[PDB]
Design a protein around this ligand. Structure first.
Ligand SMILES: O=S(=O)(O)C[C@H]1O[C@H](O)[C@H](O)[C@@H](O)[C@@H]1O
Length: 384
């Protein structure tokens, strides 16, 4: 059989390729081909909606974001792993991949947002990693003043109208102790929503973040930090491999911290991560399941942690000696993953994402005020 697997371009398809070569080498008569979609999750989702809506049978295995199971379950777009127990996997992912009793997908890898920081620069100015956005502003000012570097950004975060801007919006909202869904219903704290949009705007206005932060996607943050142009970056675990790689200016100059809190708030972060679904329209159900069981296996989890800084779905791999030798900070990441806040679980998540990310982007592009943004977001969300 020739299986086709849709892989996020953001999640190291060349490294997944090394795992698939080990699979082929030990599975005579099976070949795997990677189709590589957009960097961002909302573009991958728009593409999969069209091929899955059209019942297209070319894809066998789908790498899907943690926010996807509700949609994919309700639409019947994946083959359930009937009577599968997800107890080997972090409960947050066991839970994300179960919808009305159905195991929609096997966890592929974990993720959460961290604060990447230039540990060389904080050391140089004697600064402690910031625990509040206010400490991060103060640290940014001190470093940018001393560095006399017209290309050094204080903070890079995602302001482009992408899935990651949803995460941007919720970080200060969650930090204030608010939720967007309470007892299944939309629970919109106006004041917390406005304060989140003004916080992100304040980084641009205060000269800590670049004027065109509204054009910055997740991987732009990764590229600019890697290039030595960013003191503080909001990003995901995959960025670490690029930072420590052959094409980086910041080898051994990167610290990892929990995201700062809003003043008086909690250091909350966004749950990310991905899972492997078998397409309901695969003509190779059995062979695809065998591939997903290998790709969701502890040995592959471990390989992808070491080679791609993708956080394990297996709790035991966080303290594995080879994992922690390659990426020391993984030894302390699991509590961040297991307490990370989840975006709303809903089959209509795409419409939820569209509303929040366009509002964030509009405010950061100076199209609307934070105040109007919050009002627009609430109105649009109310009817979705
Ligand atoms: O970069 S983005 O696609 O806009 C946002 C995504 O980032 C990371 O890949 C996470 O693992 C995903 O959960 C998240 O949705």
């Amino acid at each position: 059989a020739e299986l086709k697997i849709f892989v996020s371009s953001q999640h190291q398809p060349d490294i997944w390729r090394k795992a698939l070569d080990q699979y082929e080498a030990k599975t005579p008569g099976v070949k795997v081909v990677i189709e590589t979609g957009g960097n961002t999750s909302e573009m991958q989702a728009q593409y999969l909606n069209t091929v899955m809506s059209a019942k297209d049978s070319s894809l066998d295995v789908l790498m899907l974001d943690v926010i996807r199971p509700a949609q994919f379950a309700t639409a019947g777009w994946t083959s359930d792993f009937s009577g599968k127990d997800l107890s080997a996997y972090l409960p947050t992912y066991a839970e994300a991949n179960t919808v009305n009793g159905k195991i929609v997908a096997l966890p592929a890898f974990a993720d959460s947002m961290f604060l990447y920081y230039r540990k060389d620069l904080l050391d140089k100015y004697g600064i402690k990693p910031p625990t509040t956005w206010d400490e991060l502003k103060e640290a940014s000012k001190k470093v940018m003043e001393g560095e006399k570097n017209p290309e050094l950004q204080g903070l890079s975060f995602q302001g482009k109208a992408i899935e990651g801007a949803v995460c941007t919006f919720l970080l200060p909202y969650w930090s204030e102790g608010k939720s967007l869904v309470e007892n299944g219903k939309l629970n919109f704290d106006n004041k917390a929503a406005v304060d989140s949009l003004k916080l992100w705007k304040s980084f641009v206005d205060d000269g800590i973040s670049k004027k065109n932060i509204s054009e910055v996607a997740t991987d732009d943050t990764r590229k600019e930090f890697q290039a030595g142009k960013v003191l503080f970056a909001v990003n995901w675990s995959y960025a670490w491999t690029h930072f420590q790689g052959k094409e980086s200016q910041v080898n051994d100059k990167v610290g990892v911290a929990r995201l700062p809190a809003v003043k008086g708030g909690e250091q909350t972060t966004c749950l990310g991560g991905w899972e492997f679904g078998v397409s309901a329209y695969s003509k190779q159900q059995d062979e695809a399941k065998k591939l997903v069981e290998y790709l969701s296996s502890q040995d592959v989890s471990k390989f992808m942690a070491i080679n791609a800084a993708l956080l394990p779905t297996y709790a035991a791999l966080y303290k594995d000696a080879d994992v922690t030798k390659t990426i020391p900070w993984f030894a302390d990441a699991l509590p961040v993953v297991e307490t990370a806040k989840a975006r709303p679980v809903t089959p209509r998540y795409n419409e939820v994402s569209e509303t929040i990310r366009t509002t964030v982007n509009g405010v950061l592009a100076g199209v609307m005020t934070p105040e109007d943004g919050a009002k627009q977001m609430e109105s649009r969300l109310r009817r979705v």
